C-alpha cells in the first residue's frame, strides 16, 4: 500500500494518480492543478470542486470508497505534532 | 407456507410485496369472527357447543319436526347460526298471521334461547359493558395499531381507508374513540339517531389551510341498533342499550319482544329493515370494482356463498390484488387431494391453484393469526415512536 | 389526541419541472430559523439539506436558489437520495430518482437523521478511527474503517502551509495503537 | 450550574444557545419581585419580617381568633401576603353588610397596617416619588439595557416583544420614557383615562421600532376605582397628592373598594374584569407555535402559573429558560426528604429528559444583573454617547 | 428619539442564485452617497466594497456589475469574509461561504472598518515595517512582518523606468535601521 503527499498533482504520473481509491484534498489554488484531479476521477459531480479553491486552513474534502457521500471535514489537531519549523532571523539578530 | 400462483416464496419477498401494495389508490380490510378472539370473543362452532350442551330438549324437536337443521352438521358442529334465526323468524311470523296459537309458543321459546346464547358472547367485558373508557384496556392494543397504521401512510389527494366486518360487537369503536379518530357509519344525531345512507359520500376539510377519518360498514348489524314503534331505525349508546333491553335478555328467561332487533341478519322479511342490509352489500360490491384496489382478508372462514361469488367475479380485472390468511391449508390440501372435503376447503384450494400473480395465500397455524397480521404492515419513518406526552400528563396530575 | 408527526412544516411543493423542485413558504417564517423537540435548525441558506415525507420514506434534498416572487418567497432544490427504515434503525440509500407529490410537506432535518446520513455500517465500528467533525454544523463525528483505507492506495493533496503534515502525523500515529503487528516505513 | 436535558453545559455553548432563541417569531419575558431589589425594592420575606416585628399585638388575633394564618409558616416566614389581604377584604365586607360593630373596627386596623407596610416598600425613591425625570438616575441602568437589547434584535416584519410582571412599582415605565419608547398598557386618554381591553391589538405606523407591550398581573399603584363604576389611571404626582401621602403619614383606611393592588377586591365584578383579562392574555401567548420565554426573579409559589407553564410543553415548538439561585439547597433538601412545593416543582422539571428546558443556577451568576449581559448587541448599534456633551454646551451658552 | 443605526442604507437583497447576490437600489441620491459622523462615503463602480447587516456579524462583498433594469438599478456582488467582536474591538475572518438573508439592507464601508480589514495580527507590530498606502482611497497604511517577509526568497518584477530600484533601496534601508546587527550584501 502507498501513501503519497504532494503539492503538485500536475507533476505526477497520470497512471499513478488514476489508480487510487481514497482522495483527501486541502486548498488547491491553481488552474492546472485542478485539472489533474478532475481527470483522475469520474464525472457526475461538479458543485463539489468549486469549494476546493476557497477552503480555509485545516479543512479538507474527502471522497472515495470509505465514504458514502462526499464530506467537508474539519480535521483535529495532532498531539504531539511534528518538528516545529526551521530557524528564525529575529532571535539571532537580537542576541547582543 | 406462502404461495403465489403455486410457487413458494420466502419471507423477505413477501414483505417487499406487502410494502408495495400499501401505496395504491384504494386499500381495504375485511375481518371476521376470528379476529376478535383475542379480546374475549368466540367462534361460530364454540357457540353451537354451548347451545347443544345447555338446551338438549329443543334440539330433538328442531330436527325431527320442522327440518330446520341436519343431523350430520349438528353432530360435526357445522351449523350456520345466523342463517337459522332468519328462518325461525319467518316461521313465527307466518304462524302469527294465520293464528295458530299452539305453534307460537314453540318458536317464542327457542328464539329466546338463541338470542340468550349469541348475545352473551359479544359483550367482551361481561358486566363492564356499560362503563366508560373501555378502549384503555390491554385487550384492544392491536386494533389501535391497525387503525393507526392504515391512516398514517396516505399521501395528500388520496382516498380514505375502508373497513368491512361481519362482527357485530363494539371493539373497533372503542379502539378508535381512544385515538381521537372519527369513523363514519351512516348515522347522525344525538337525541335521536337516524340512518342516512347518503352520508357515505361526505368528507372533512380544514378552513385555515384534519384528514383523520375512515368508513366502517357493518354487514350483519349491531347490538345498539333497534327499531322502535315508528318505522325508523335508531342507535343508542352502550349504557342506554344495556339499561333498555340487553339486561333482560341476559337475565330474564321469558323475554321476547318481536321484530325489534337488527342483529344478526334476522328480520329480513320486513321492507324497512332489509333496506339497511342491502346498502352495505351494494357498497361492498362497488368498492372492489375500481382500477387500483388492494384488499386484505383475515379472520374469515369462507363459509358464505354470496361473498365468495362477488370475490371471484372481481378477479377478471387485471389490477385487483388480494391477500388471504387461512391457518389450515395443510389439513385441507390432503382432504381435497384424496376425496374432496367441504365447500370452504374446496373454495380455498381452487383459489390456491390459480396460475395468477394476483392471489397470495398465507398459512401456518399461529403464523397467520390476527396479531401476526399487524406486524407484516409497514410503519412510517416520521411517525413518533416514543413516549413524551404521558410523562407530562403524570407530572400535571401529580401537581397539587 | 392523535399526532401524525412531532415536527412542523416549512412549505409545500407547488411545481415539478423534471428533476428540480419548487417550494412556497408560509407567512410567519422571517428569521431563517425553525425549532422542534431537539433544538433549532436553519433552513433557508443555499447549501442546506431538507427533506420531504413521501409515504413511508424520507427524500433528502439540497438547496440552490432562494428569491422573491407581503410578497412570497420561493426555493429550488435537488435530491440526492432517501432514508429507509428496516428493522429497528434506519439506513441511507444514495439513489435519487424519486420525487414527492404536489402538496408534499417540506420539513427541516434534525440532528438525529444527520447522524444517520454520515454514518458507517454498525458491524465495522470496531475497525474505525476518528478524524474530525462536520464542518457546517460541528455536531457530527466522522469515522472511517481502516480496512477500506489501507487496502488500495491513498492520496493527500494541498498547497504549502495548510496542514498536510498534521494529517499525516495524526493518521499514522493512530494505526500503530490499533494494529500493532503492522509494518510502516 | 447550567443544565439542559438532565446533563451539563458550558459557558460558550450556552451563550450561543441564547442567541438563536432571540430570533424566533415570538419572544417574551416574565419578571418577579427579585428583579427590583437592585434598585430599592424588597422580597416578600422581608415584608413579612418587618410587619411581624412592628405589630406584635395584631399577630395573635390572626392566628387564634380568626384562623387566617398558621404558626409554622409564620415562624419560618413563608406566608402569602396578597392572599391574606384578599381574605381580610372579604371578611370586612361580610361584617359590614350584616351589621356587626365589633369586627368592622377590628379589621380596619389590620388592613391599614398591611397597606402601610406594602406601600412603603414599593416607592423605589422615597420622597422623590413626586418629581419628574426619575428614570435618569443610575439605579435604572439595567432596565434600559434590557429594553434596548430586546427591541433592536428584531428583523423588519416581525412582532414586537411582550413583557409580563408580578410587580406593582413604576421601574419599567420610568426606564422606557427616558429612552423614547412607547408602551401599550391598555389605557387611553389624559383628562379621564380608562381601561379598554382592545388596545392590545394596535400598533403604530409611519405615514411619511417604536413600541412594546406591558402586562401587569397584580395591579399598579396608580389604579383606583371612584364613586363611578369605572377604573382610572393617574400620574405619580397626582396619586401621591390624592391618596398615597395619607396611607403613610396617617391612620387612614375608610374606602374598602378603592385600590387595585395587590390582587385585592376580587369579589367585585367591576374589578375582577381587569385581572381576568390580564391572565387570559398571558395564557394565549404561550400557546402559539415558535415561541420562547425567559423567567427571572420569580419564585415558583403560584399554583395557577405552574399549571399553565407545564401544560404548554405538550407542543414541540415551545422553549423556556429559567433562573433559580438557591438550587443546590433545594436538591439536597428534596433528596434527603422534605422541602416546600416550590422546591419540588423546580426539581421535578430540572430532572426531565427534555431539550426544551434549561435551568441556570449559581449564587450571583443567576441574578438580574447577570441575565442582561447574556443578551447580545448588534454590530452596528451606536454606543458612543456624544449628544450629552453637546447639550451641556448648549445649556452653557445660557 | 431612539435610533437603531447612525449610517443610512443603500438598497436591499432580492435574490441568491448560488454564490451571487442581487441588490435593488433606492431612488435618487439615496442609492449612491451617504453622509455620517466621520465624513462621506459612496459606492459607484465595479471594484468597490459593500457590507450587509446580519445581526452579530457583518458580511463583506465586492461589486462586479451595474445596469438599468425613473428606471430601476441593480448590482451583483460576491462574498469575501465577515467581521465580529472579540474583547472591545473587532476582527476580520476570511471564509467566504456565509451569505445574508433576503430583505437585509446594504450599507457602504467606512474607513474605520477598512482599517480593520487590512491589518496584521495584533502582535507582530513590534517587528513590522511600513511600505505605503492603499491605492483606491489612500487613507489606510500597509504594514508587513519582517520574519514572514524575509524567511524564504522574495521576487520583484516589472519593466524599466517604473520603480524597482526605489523599492529595493527603501526596503533595505529601513530593515538596516530597525536591526543594526544585520548582515546585507
Ligand atoms: N386468533 C385467530 N386469528 C385469526 N383467525 C383465527 C383465529 N382463531 C381462529 N381463527 C380462524 O377464524 C375463522 C373463524 O371462522 P367462523 O367464525 O366460523 O366464520 P365467520 O367469521 O366468517 O362466521 C360468520 C359468517 O358466517 C356466514 O358464513 C356469514 O357469511 C358470516 O359472515 C376460522 O377460519 C378459524 O381458523
Ligand atoms: N437580586 C436578585 N436577582 C434575581 N433574583 C433574586 C435576587 N434576589 C433574590 N432573588 C430571588 O428572587 C426570588 C424572590 O421570590 P419572591 O419575591 O418571594 O417571589 P415572587 O416575586 O413570585 O412573589 C410574588 C408572588 O407571590 C405569589 O406567589 C404570586 O405568584 C406572586 O407573583 C427568590 O427566588 C430570590 O432568591
Ligand atoms: N487542522 C488543524 N488544526 C489546527 N492547526 C493546524 C491544522 N492543520 C494545520 N495546522 C497548523 O498549521 C501549521 C503548519 O501546518 P503544516 O502541516 O506544516 O502545513 P504543510 O505541512 O502542509 O506546509 C502547524 O503548526 C499546525 O499547528
Ligand atoms: N514610488 C515612487 N514615487 C515617485 N517616483 C518614483 C517612484 N518609484 C519610481 N519613481 C521614479 O522613477 C524614476 C526611475 O525609476 P527607477 O527606480 O530607475 O526604476 P527602474 O530601476 O525599474 O528603471 C525615478 O526618477 C523616480 O522619480
Ligand atoms: Mg509539510
Ligand atoms: Mg534600475
Bridge-partner residues for B248, per DSSP?
Answer: none
The verdict on the CB of residue C165 being under 6 Å from ligand 3 is: yes
Please tell me whether residue B86 adopts helix, strand or coil conformation: helix
Spell out which residues of chain C touch residue B157, defining contact as CB-CB under 8 Å: 101-103
D158 touches chain C (CB under 8 A): yes
Look at D289 and C37 and tell me if their CB atoms are within 8 Å: no
The verdict on the CB of residue C160 being under 6 Å from ligand 3 is: yes
For residues E23 and E75, the answer to whether their CB atoms sit within 8 Å is yes
Q: Pick E181's closest partner by Cβ from A54, A88, A93.
A: A93
Q: Mutate which of E166, E167, E173 to test ligand 4's pocket (most atoms within 8 Å of Cβ)?
A: E166
Calculate helix-pair angle for B82-98, B111-120, nearest 10 degrees: 150
Closest CA to D113 of D219, D250, D222: D250
Nearest CA to ligand 3 atom 3: A77
Tell me which ligand sits closest to the C-alpha of residue E162.
Answer: 4
**B33 Cα–ligand 1 center, Å:** 5
Residues of C with CB under 8 A from a CB of E: 30, 32, 44-47, 64-68, 73
For the four alpha carbons of B122, B125, B128 and B134, in that order, the dihedral sign comes to negative
C-alpha span between C5 and A74 (Å, rounded)? 34
Resolution in A for the shown PDB structure? 2.9
Q: Mutate which of B139, B303, B332 to test ligand 1's pocket (most atoms within 8 Å of Cβ)?
A: B303
C-alpha span between B273 and D80 (Å, rounded)? 68
* Deposited experimental method: cryo-EM
Q: How many CB atoms lie within 10 A of CB B232?
A: 12
C-alpha span between B334 and B345 (Å, rounded)? 10
Give the list of residues 6+ apart from residue D244 with CB closer than 8 angstroms, or none: D119, D123, D129, D221
C-alpha span between D161 and D158 (Å, rounded)? 9
Length of chain A: 96
Three cell numbers, residue E126: 513590534
E110 Rama class: left (phi>0) / alpha (psi -120 to 50) / beta: beta
**B308 Cα–ligand 2 center, Å:** 75
B295: enclosing H helix or E strand: strand B293-298
Q: Mutate which of D29, D30, D33 to test ligand 2's pocket (most atoms within 8 Å of Cβ)?
A: D33
Nearest CA to ligand 3 atom 20: C161
Closest CA to B321 of B290, B282, B348: B290
C-alpha span between C6 and E66 (Å, rounded)? 47
C-alpha span between A66 and D297 (Å, rounded)? 54
Q: Verify E-D touch: 3 or more CB pairs within 8 A.
A: yes
Q: Pick C56's closest partner by Cβ from B378, B384, B388.
A: B378
> In chain D, whose CA is at the least distance from the CA of E2?
D180
Owner of C-alpha cell 325431527? B64
Bridge-partner residues for E73, per DSSP?
Answer: E68
Nearest CA to ligand 3 atom 12: C163
**How does DSSP assign chain C, residue by residue?**
---S-SS---EEEEEE-SS-EEEEE-SS--SSEEE-SS-EEE-SSTT-EEEEEETTEEEEEEEEEEEE----EEEEEEEEEEEEE-SSSEEEE--------TT-EEEE--HHHHHHHT---GGGGGGEEEEEEESSSS-SEEEEEHHHHSSS-EEEE--TTSSHHHHHHHHHHHHHTT-SS----
For the four alpha carbons of D296, D302, D308 and D313, in that order, the dihedral sign comes to positive
C-alpha span between A93 and A82 (Å, rounded)? 26
Three cell numbers, residue C68: 422573491
Q: Which residues of D107-126 are buried (b: 16+ CB within 10 A; e: fewer)?
A: bbebbbbbbbbbbebbbbbe
C-alpha span between B245 and B255 (Å, rounded)? 10
Instruction: Report the gap between the CA of C101 and the closest CA in chain A (Å).
Output: 26
Tell me which ligand sits closest to the C-alpha of residue D36.
Answer: 2
For residue E29, give the DSSP letter.
G
Look at A93 and E150 and tell me if their CB atoms are within 8 Å: no
For residues C1 and B148, the answer to whether their CB atoms sit within 8 Å is no
Owner of C-alpha cell 341498533? B225
The verdict on the CB of residue E161 being under 6 Å from ligand 4 is: yes
Look at E18 and C66 and tell me if their CB atoms are within 8 Å: no
For residues B48 and B54, the answer to whether their CB atoms sit within 8 Å is no
Q: Which residues of E18-34 are buried (b: 16+ CB within 10 A; e: fewer)?
A: eeebbbbbbeeeebeeb
Chains that touch C (3 or more CB pairs under 8 A): A, B, D, E
Look at C153 and A19 and tell me if their CB atoms are within 8 Å: yes
For residues B196 and B186, the answer to whether their CB atoms sit within 8 Å is yes
Spell out which residues of chain D touch residue B400, defining contact as CB-CB under 8 Å: 303, 307
Chains that touch E (3 or more CB pairs under 8 A): A, C, D
Look at D310 and B389 and tell me if their CB atoms are within 8 Å: no
Look at A29 and C130 and tell me if their CB atoms are within 8 Å: no
Closest CA to E151 of B343, A86, A7, B117: A86
**E88 Cα–ligand 3 center, Å:** 29
Amino acid at each position: 500500500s502507498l501513501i503519497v503527499s504532494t503539492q503538485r498533482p500536475s507533476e505526477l504520473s497520470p497512471t499513478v494518480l488514476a489508480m487510487c481509491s481514497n482522495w483527501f484534498s486541502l486548498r488547491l489554488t491553481n488552474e492546472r492543478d485542478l485539472q489533474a484531479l478532475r481527470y483522475a476521477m469520474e464525472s457526475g459531480n461538479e458543485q463539489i470542486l468549486k469549494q476546493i479553491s476557497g477552503l480555509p486552513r485545516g479543512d479538507a474534502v474527502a471522497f472515495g470508497s470509505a465514504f458514502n457521500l462526499p464530506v467537508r471535514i474539519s480535521i483535529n489537531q495532532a498531539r504531539p505534532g511534528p518538528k516545529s519549523s526551521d530557524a528564525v532571523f529575529s532571535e539571532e539578530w537580537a542576541n547582543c | 407456507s406462502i404461495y403465489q400462483g403455486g410457487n413458494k416464496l420466502n419471507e423477505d419477498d413477501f414483505r417487499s410485496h406487502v410494502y408495495s401494495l400499501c401505496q395504491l389508490d384504494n386499500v381495504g380490510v375485511l375481518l371476521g369472527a376470528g379476529a376478535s378472539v383475542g379480546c374475549g370473543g368466540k367462534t361460530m362452532k364454540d357457540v353451537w357447543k354451548s347451545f347443544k350442551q345447555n338446551y338438549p330438549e329443543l334440539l330433538g324437536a328442531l330436527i325431527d319436526k320442522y327440518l330446520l337443521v341436519s343431523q350430520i352438521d349438528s353432530d360435526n358442529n357445522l351449523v350456520n347460526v345466523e342463517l337459522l334465526i332468519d328462518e325461525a323468524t319467518k316461521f313465527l311470523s307466518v304462524a302469527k298471521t294465520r293464528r295458530c296459537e299452539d305453534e307460537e309458543e314453540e318458536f317464542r321459546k327457542i328464539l329466546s334461547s338463541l338470542y340468550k346464547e349469541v348475545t352473551k358472547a359479544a359483550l367482551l367485558t361481561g358486566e363492564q359493558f356499560r362503563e366508560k373508557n373501555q378502549g384503555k384496556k390491554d385487550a384492544f392494543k392491536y386494533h389501535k395499531e391497525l387503525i393507526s397504521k392504515l391512516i398514517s401512510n396516505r399521501q395528500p389527494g388520496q382516498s380514505a381507508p375502508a373497513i368491512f366486518t361481519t362482527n357485530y360487537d363494539l371493539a373497533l369503536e372503542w379502539a378508535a374513540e381512544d385515538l381521537g379518530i372519527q369513523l363514519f357509519n351512516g348515522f347522525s344525531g344525538l337525541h335521536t339517531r337516524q340512518f342516512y345512507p347518503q352520508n357515505f359520500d361526505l368528507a372533512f376539510r380544514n378552513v385555515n389551510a384534519g384528514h383523520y377519518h375512515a368508513y366502517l360498514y357493518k354487514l350483519h348489524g349491531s347490538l345498539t341498533w333497534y327499531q322502535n314503534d315508528s318505522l325508523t331505525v335508531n342507535e343508542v349508546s352502550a349504557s342506554q342499550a344495556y339499561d333498555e333491553y340487553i339486561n333482560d335478555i341476559i337475565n330474564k328467561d321469558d323475554f321476547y319482544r318481536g321484530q325489534h332487533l337488527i342483529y344478526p341478519g334476522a328480520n329480513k322479511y320486513s321492507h324497512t329493515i332489509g333496506f339497511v342490509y342491502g346498502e352495505m352489500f351494494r357498497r361492498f360490491g362497488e368498492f372492489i370494482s375500481k382500477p387500483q384496489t388492494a384488499l386484505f382478508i383475515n379472520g374469515f372462514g369462507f363459509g358464505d356463498y354470496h361473498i365468495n361469488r362477488i370475490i371471484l367475479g372481481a378477479l377478471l380485472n387485471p389490477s385487483f390484488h388480494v391477500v388471504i390468511y387461512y391457518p389450515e391449508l395443510k389439513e385441507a390440501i390432503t382432504k381435497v387431494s384424496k376425496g374432496g372435503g367441504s365447500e370452504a376447503e374446496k373454495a380455498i384450494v381452487t383459489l390456491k391453484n390459480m396460475a395468477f400473480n394476483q392471489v397470495t395465500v398465507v398459512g401456518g397455524g399461529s403464523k397467520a393469526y390476527f396479531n401476526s397480521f399487524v406486524e407484516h404492515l409497514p410503519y412510517p419513518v416520521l411517525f413518533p415512536r416514543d413516549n413524551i406526552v404521558d410523562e407530562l400528563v403524570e407530572a400535571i396530575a401529580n401537581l397539587s | 389526541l392523535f399526532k401524525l408527526t412531532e415536527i412542523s412544516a416549512i412549505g409545500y411543493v407547488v411545481g415539478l419541472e423534471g428533476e428540480r423542485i419548487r417550494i412556497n413558504l408560509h407567512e410567519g417564517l422571517q428569521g431563517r430559523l425553525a425549532s422542534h423537540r431537539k433544538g433549532v435548525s436553519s433552513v433557508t441558506q443555499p447549501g442546506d439539506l431538507i427533506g420531504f415525507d413521501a409515504g413511508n420514506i424520507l427524500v433528502v434534498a439540497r438547496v440552490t436558489d432562494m428569491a422573491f416572487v407581503i410578497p412570497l418567497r420561493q426555493i429550488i432544490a435537488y435530491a440526492i437520495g432517501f432514508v429507509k427504515r428496516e428493522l429497528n434503525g434506519y439506513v441511507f440509500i444514495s439513489e435519487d430518482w424519486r420525487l414527492p407529490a404536489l402538496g408534499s410537506s417540506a420539513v427541516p432535518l434534525t440532528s438525529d437523521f444527520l447522524n444517520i446520513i454520515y454514518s458507517i455500517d454498525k458491524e465495522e465500528l470496531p475497525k474505525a478511527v476518528e478524524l474530525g467533525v462536520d464542518s457546517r454544523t460541528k455536531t457530527v463525528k466522522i469515522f472511517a474503517s481502516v480496512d477500506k483505507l489501507l487496502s488500495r492506495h491513498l492520496a493527500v493533496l494541498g498547497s504549502t502551509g495548510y496542514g498536510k503534515s498534521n494529517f499525516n502525523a495524526l493518521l499514522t500515529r493512530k494505526v500503530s495503537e490499533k494494529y500493532p503487528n503492522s509494518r510502516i516505513v
